[PDB]
Amino acid sequence: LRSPPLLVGVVSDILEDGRVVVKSSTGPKFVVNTSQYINEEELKPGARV
């Protein structure tokens, strides 16, 4: 009930310094940090994350 919140987004671009631009299901785009808790080959523009 207290949530493990994960917000759904889709990936908009990927930076070659190791950050990822993800657009949220809310509307905005944010810059987020690249995985180290999961695959980084499963990140591509159009990856649901």
**14-32 burial: b if 16+ Cβ within 10 Å, else e:** beeeeebebeeeeeeeeee
- Cβ 4 to another protein, closest distance in Å? 8
Pick between residue 14 and residue 49 the one whose CB is nearest to another protein: 49
Out of 1, 26, 39, 46, point to the residue binding another protein (CB under 8 A). 1
Q: Is 3 in the site for another protein (CB under 8 A)?
A: yes
Is 14 within 8 Å of 23 (Cβ atoms)? no
Report the distance separating Cα 20 and Cα 12, nearest Å.
8
Q: Is 26 in the site for another protein (CB under 8 A)?
A: no
Binding site for another protein (CB under 8 A): 1-5
